[PDB]
Design a protein around this ligand. Structure first.
Ligand SMILES: Cc1ccc(CSc2ncn(-c3ccccc3)n2)cc1
Ligand SMILES: Cc1ccc(CSc2ncn(-c3ccccc3)n2)cc1
Ligand SMILES: [Mn+2]
Ligand SMILES: [Mn+2]
Lengths: 655, 663
C-alpha cells in the first residue's frame, strides 16, 4: 500500500529565512496518519518522499523541525495541493497546515479537521492573551517587550534596522544643534525656521508660508492632521454665544446668522473633550490646554471655508472672550494656535492612538484568537494586521511610559492622554468608524474642498466591493454567516475586549446578515489601512512649523482681548527641547521605515483559489483608478492632498 | 608726532562656526604705555594680514589686547605682529572669543613668574589667574572623593573646555544609532535571564571586534583567563606573592595537579613564580537591586602560577571570599567545568567592579580632572608648565561633568544595570582613596612594588615602561629649558601653588599618599609632571581601549551577579550558571555604554601631537619633534612584537593613545 508524492518547499527571501536543521514531514489522510518522513532563503527546491501506506484523501500537512521562515508547501499525489504557510519555525516545533482552499467550519465536517481548527485556536489563545492595560481603555496584547513577541508578529529585521538607523541620525542631528537641550523659549518666530534645516517637505514649507491665512487655518479641519471633528451646525450652541454683530464683517450685510444655519454653511469644530483635562509639567513649568470651539463659514459658490469665531473656554462668560478674525492679529492668531494645540492633543490621543492604533490592535488580536489559518476571513484580514502588535507594544514600551516623549514634551502628558482615551471611549460609535455613515452624520457630505471625504468615500467603496466579492464567494447566505461559530466569536471578542460591551457604541455584538458582515469587515480593513494613513501621513507636515501644531502651552488661555503680544505669544509656546522632542517623534512616525506593502498588494498568497485571486486583481485595478483620479485632482491644487493615495497607503498599521 | 606701522597677521580656527561677522580690533601695550584700540578693517581657516598704524610709539611690545564688538563666537588661533624694518612677534591664542570682551595675550616666549619682572606682565598673571579661579572652582562632590569641577550641566561649561562640534557630531551619531538600535530591539527593556549562552552571541550582531571574538572563542581557557590580568582591561592588580595569604589557605595537594610532583608550593614562593590577584577591597560592599532582584558581589582571591621557560600563566586556586572556611571552598582547575567556570566568572565580575570604579573612574578620570583643574587655576597662559600640560587636559572637564550628569545619577547604567550600584561605586572610591600612593601612579615603582618586573607576557608593563621613558626624557628636556636650577622650582610660586592644590583637592592632604605637597628638586618636578602626563594619556588609554573587547562576551565580563557565590562544590549546573548571570536589559545597557566608551569619537590628536603651537621658541619645538620620533620608535617595536601574537596588545600603541582623557 506504498504511496509517493513530490514535495515543493519555498523558504523566505528575508534575511536569514533559511536554516541548516533537518526537516521531517508527516501526512494525515482520511484513512490514517503517515510516519515522520525526513526531507538557504528564497530556495524553491523539491523533494521526494514515499508514504509507507496510503492515507487516502489528504487532510493535514505536519512539518516538524529539528529560525526558518517557510512560505508555502506543495505536495503532488499520483493533481496539486498547495499548503500556504508564511510562518516562522524556531528551534524544535511542528506546524499543521490545511490545504489552501479557504474553509469555514461548516464547509468540511470530517472530525480530523474540526479538531485541528480548535487545537490551533486553543494554542493561539494561550499564545496571544488580552490584558487590562488601563481602566477605560481597550484591552491590548498582554506582552511587555518586543523581546516577548513571537517571530510571526515581530518586526522584520530589515525594517527594524531602517527604523533605528533613522532615529539615530535624526536624534543625533538635533542634539548636536543644541535643540534638544534648550529648556527655554524660542528666541523668535524667526528661529523656529531652524526646524526646516532638520527635515524639509513641500507640505511643511506650505504650512509655514500660509500659517497665518484663515483659509489655510480653516482647510486643515478638512485636509489636515485631524479632519474627522468638523460637523455642520443645525443650531448655534448655547455654550458658544455668537451674535450677528461679531460675524457681520465676514458674512456682510447680505445674510443673517440664522439665515446661514438654515442654508447649512455654518460648521463647528468642538474640542470640548479636553475641558478640565489634567495637564503636564515641562521643565518645571505648568502646561495648559484649552477646550476650544471654532465656528466655520463655507463661502458661497465653492469659495474658501472661513472661521468666524473662536471661544477657547467651554464655559461662556466675561472671562472667556469670543475672538474673531477682525480682532487684533495677535489675539486672533493666538486663538488659532490654541485650537491648533487642541487639535494636537485630540489627534495624537484619540484620532491616531485610540482609533488608528488601539482599535486596529483589537481587530488583530481577535483575528489571531478566533479565526484559524484556513478561514477565509483570516486570509482576507491577516495582511491588514501585519506588524500592528509590534508597533503597539513598541508604543507602550517607548512612548507613553514615564520619562518618554509623551511625558517629556506634551502639555497633556501620559495622564491627559489616558483620560482623553477613557472619556472618548464612552462616546465611541459605529457610525464614526464607518466613513459614509460618519460623514452623513456630521452633515459634511456637501461642503466643498473636503479631500479626505472625497478620497475616503472612493477608497471605502473599493474595499466594500472587494469584501463583498469575497464574502459572496464563501458565504452563500445569511444562515451561513449566522452559523459560522468562529466568525461570531470574533465579533463578540471585539465588542467586549475592544469596545467594552458598550451598547451606546452601536458596534454589532453579532453578525446576522452578509450585508452586516461586509460592512463590518470593510470598517476593520479600512481603519487598519486608509484611516490610519490619513491621520498619520501628515504629522510632520503639520508640526514642522511648530505654531501650526503646538504640542503644549505654557500660559493659560487669555481671559481678555487686547493683551496678547509677540513676546507673550512666544512665551506661551512650548520650550525648544520639547518642541524638537515632539517634532523628531512625529517625523519618525510619519512614514514606514522599510518593508512596506501598499493597500491591496498581497505577496503572502494565502488565497490560492482562482475566485479570490480574480477578486484581488479587480480590487488592485480599482485602487489604481482611484490613485489616478487623485493625481488628476492634485494637479491643480497649490496644496495637493496625498494622504489617501492608495499606493502611499499601507495595508496595516505598522507606524 | 610719532606714527607706528604694524603688520598684523591673524589665523582663525577652521572649526565650524569659528568665523565671525563681528568687527574685531586690537590694542598694543608696551613699555611706553597702551595704545588706542585699532580695529582690523574673519572666516574659518583663513589667515589674513592687516596694516594699521599706532598714533604713538609704544616701545618694546609687552601684551596684545584683542577686542570684539557686540553674540557671535570666534576661535582665534594666533596673532603675529610684524613691526617696520623687520622683526616678528607670535601671540599664541587657541581660545573661543565669545560674546563681546577682550583677550590679553603675551608673546609666545614662555615665561616663568620670575623670568620677567616687568610690572605690567606680573599684573597680567594675577588678573588672569584670578579670572581662572572665579571661572573654574572646586566642589566636594562626595565625602572621601576627589574634589571636582563645580558645574552641574554640560550646558553650563565654557566653549574653551566644551567638546568640539565635530566631536559632538561623531559621538552623538554613534551613540544615537547604538542606543536606538538596542532600545528598538527591546534589549534595554527585557528583564529576565538569558535563554542560553548561545543567545548571548546576539551581542555580536549589535557590534563586533576581532578582540571581542577572541574572548568568546577562548573564554573557557585557563591560560586566557590568567593572561587577562596582564594584558586585559584591568592589568594593574596582579602582584608577586612573598607568602600565600593566611586568609586564603592553599595546600600542595590542592595544586599538586598543576605544579606537578617536581616542586612544592613553598618552593615556588622562593622562585618568585607565584602571583596573587586580590579583589579584597570589595569585601562587605553594598550591593544593588536590578529589576527588583538583589544583586551580589564577591571579594575573590586568585592564585596564579608562572610556568617556566616563558610558559603560559595559569590559575592555581580561586577563593571567592576573604573569610576562609567550610562555606568558602577553594576552587581548583580540577573541579567540575561549571564549578571552575563559575569561580572564574565571579573573579571576572570582581574585575568589572574594581576596574570601572577604581582603575577607569578614580585613577583615569577623577585624578586627571584634578590635574586639569589645578593647571587652569594656578598656571597662567604664558607659563611653560601650562604650555606643556594644556593639551593633556583637552575635553577632560566636559567628559567628567557628562559622567556625573549622565552616568552616576540614579536611573543611569550604574544605578539600573550595575550589581554594585551608585553606593557601591562611591564606597569603592572612598575606600581606594586611603590606599592611594605616589608609587602606584608612577609606573616604574608600580611594577617594582608589585614585583611584576620579571613576569613574561606582560605587555602593559613592556609598553608602559617604554612610554613612561619617553615622556620622562621629554619632560626632562622641557624642564631643563625653563628651570636652570632646583631653586628655580622652589622659586616658582605658581608651580608650588599648583602642586599644593592637587595634594589638597585631589588627595585630601593624605600623608599616606606620599604625594608631594611641594617640589624642591627639578628632578622631582620632572617626575611629578611625567606622572601627571602619563596618567592623563597612557594610563587611561590602557584601561579604556579594551572595555568592549572584554565585555562583548557577557560571561567574560558580566557587570552584576544575581545569586550569592556558592558555599559548596559540586552544586554548579549550566542552569544555575545562567541564573546567576545578570539580566538581559542589564547586560545590553552596560555593553552599550562600554562600546561607546572604548574609542575616541573623532577629533583625535595622539600622544605627542600638539597642533596648537603654544611653544613658539625653537628649543621646546625641537624637544617635541624629538619626543614624537621616540614615540614612533616605540610604536614600531609594538607592531613588531604584535606581529607574532595571536591576540596582539594594542592598547598602548602611541598612535592609538590620546593626549588627554576625553572619553
Ligand atoms: C507628542 C506625541 C508623540 C507621539 C505620539 C504617538 S501616537 C503613536 N501610535 C504608535 N506610536 C508608536 C509606535 C512605535 C514606537 C513609538 C510610538 N505612536 C503622540 C503624541
Ligand atoms: C559602566 C561604567 C562605570 C564607570 C565608568 C567610569 S568612566 C567615564 N567617564 C565619563 N564617562 C561617561 C560620560 C558621559 C557619558 C558616558 C560615559 N564614563 C565607565 C563605565
Ligand atoms: Mn501610527
Ligand atoms: Mn574613560
Amino acid at each position: 500500500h506504498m504511496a509517493e508524492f513530490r514535495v515543493r518547499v519555498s523558504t523566505g527571501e528575508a534575511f536569514g529565512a533559511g536554516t541548516w536543521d533537518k526537516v521531517s514531514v508527516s501526512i494525515v489522510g482520511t484513512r490514517g496518519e503517515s510516519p515522520p518522513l525526513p526531507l538557504t532563503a528564497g530556495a524553491e527546491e523539491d523533494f521526494q518522499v514515499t508514504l509507507p501506506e496510503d492515507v487516502g484523501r489528504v487532510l493535514l500537512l505536519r512539518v516538524h523541525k529539528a529560525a526558518w521562515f517557510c512560505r508555502w508547501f506543495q505536495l503532488t499525489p499520483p493533481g496539486h495541493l498547495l499548503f500556504p504557510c508564511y510562518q516562522w519555525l524556531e528551534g524544535a516545533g511542528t506546524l499543521v497546515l490545511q490545504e489552501g482552499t479557504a474553509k469555514v467550519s461548516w464547509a468540511d465536517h470530517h472530525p480530523v479537521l474540526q479538531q485541528q481548527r480548535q487545537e490551533e485556536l486553543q494554542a493561539r489563545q494561550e499564545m496571544y492573551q488580552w490584558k487590562a492595560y488601563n481602566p477605560g481603555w481597550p484591552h491590548c496584547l498582554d506582552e511587555k517587550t518586543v523581546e516577548d513577541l513571537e517571530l510571526n508578529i515581530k518586526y522584520s529585521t530589515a525594517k527594524n534596522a531602517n527604523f533605528y538607523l533613522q532615529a539615530g541620525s535624526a536624534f543625533a542631528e538635533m542634539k548636536i544643534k543644541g535643540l534638544l537641550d534648550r529648556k527655554g523659549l524660542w528666541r523668535s518666530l524667526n528661529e523656529m525656521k531652524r526646524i526646516f534645516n532638520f527635515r524639509r517637505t513641500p507640505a511643511a514649507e506650505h504650512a509655514f508660508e500660509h500659517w497665518q491665512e484663515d483659509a489655510f487655518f480653516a482647510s486643515q479641519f478638512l485636509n489636515g492632521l485631524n479632519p474627522v471633528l468638523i460637523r455642520r451646525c443645525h443650531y448655534l450652541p448655547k455654550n458658544f454665544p455668537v451674535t450677528d454683530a461679531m460675524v457681520a464683517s465676514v458674512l456682510g450685510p447680505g445674510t443673517s446668522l440664522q439665515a446661514e444655519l438654515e442654508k447649512g454653511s455654518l460648521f463647528l469644530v468642538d474640542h470640548g473633550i479636553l475641558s478640565g483635562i489634567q495637564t503636564n509639567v515641562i521643565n518645571g513649568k505648568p502646561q495648559f490646554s484649552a477646550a476650544p470651539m471654532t465656528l466655520l463659514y463655507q463661502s458661497p459658490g465653492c469659495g474658501p471655508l472661513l472661521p468666524l469665531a473662536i471661544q477657547l473656554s467651554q464655559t461662556p462668560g466675561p472671562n472667556s472672550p469670543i475672538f474673531l478674525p477682525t480682532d487684533d492679529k495677535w489675539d486672533w492668531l493666538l486663538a488659532k494656535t490654541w485650537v491648533r494645540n487642541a487639535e494636537f492633543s485630540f489627534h495624537e490621543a484619540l484620532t491616531h492612538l485610540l482609533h488608528s492604533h488601539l482599535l486596529p490592535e483589537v481587530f488583530t488580536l481577535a483575528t489571531l484568537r478566533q479565526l484559524p489559518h484556513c478561514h477565509p476571513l483570516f486570509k482576507l484580514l491577516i495582511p491588514h494586521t501585519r506588524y500592528t502588535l509590534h508597533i503597539n507594544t513598541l508604543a507602550r514600551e517607548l512612548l507613553i511610559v514615564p520619562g518618554q516623549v509623551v511625558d517629556r514634551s506634551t502639555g497633556i502628558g501620559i495622564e491627559g492622554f489616558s483620560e482623553l482615551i477613557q472619556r472618548n471611549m464612552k462616546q465611541l460609535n459605529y457610525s464614526l468608524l464607518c466613513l459614509p455613515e460618519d460623514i452623513r452624520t456630521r452633515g459634511v457630505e456637501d461642503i466643498p474642498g473636503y479631500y479626505y471625504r472625497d478620497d475616503g468615500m472612493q477608497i471605502w467603496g473599493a474595499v466594500e466591493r472587494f469584501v463583498s466579492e469575497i464574502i459572496g464567494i464563501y458565504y452563500p447566505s445569511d444562515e451561513s454567516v449566522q452559523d459560522d461559530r468562529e466568525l461570531q466569536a470574533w465579533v463578540r471578542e471585539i465588542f467586549s475586549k475592544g469596545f467594552l460591551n458598550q451598547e451606546s457604541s452601536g458596534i454589532p455584538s453579532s453578525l446576522e446578515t452578509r450585508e452586516a458582515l461586509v460592512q463590518y469587515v470593510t470598517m476593520v480593513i479600512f481603519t487598519c489601512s486608509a484611516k490610519h494613513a490619513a491621520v498619520s501621513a501628515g504629522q510632520f507636515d503639520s508640526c514642522a512649523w511648530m505654531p501650526n501644531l503646538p504640542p503644549s502651552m505654557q500660559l493659560p488661555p487669555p481671559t481678555s482681548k487686547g493683551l496678547a503680544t509677540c513676546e507673550g505669544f512666544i512665551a506661551t509656546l512650548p520650550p525648544v527641547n520639547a518642541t524638537c522632542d515632539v517634532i523628531l517623534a512625529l517625523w519618525l512616525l510619519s512614514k514606514e521605515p522599510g518593508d512596506q506593502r501598499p493597500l491591496g498588494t498581497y505577496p503572502d498568497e494565502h488565497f490560492t483559489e482562482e475566485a479570490p485571486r480574480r477578486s484581488i486583481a479587480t480590487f488592485q485595478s480599482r485602487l489604481a483608478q482611484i490613485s489616478r483620479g487623485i493625481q488628476e485632482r492634485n494637479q491643480g491644487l497649490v496644496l495637493p492632498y496625498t494622504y489617501l493615495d492608495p499606493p502611499l497607503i499601507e495595508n496595516s498599521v505598522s507606524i
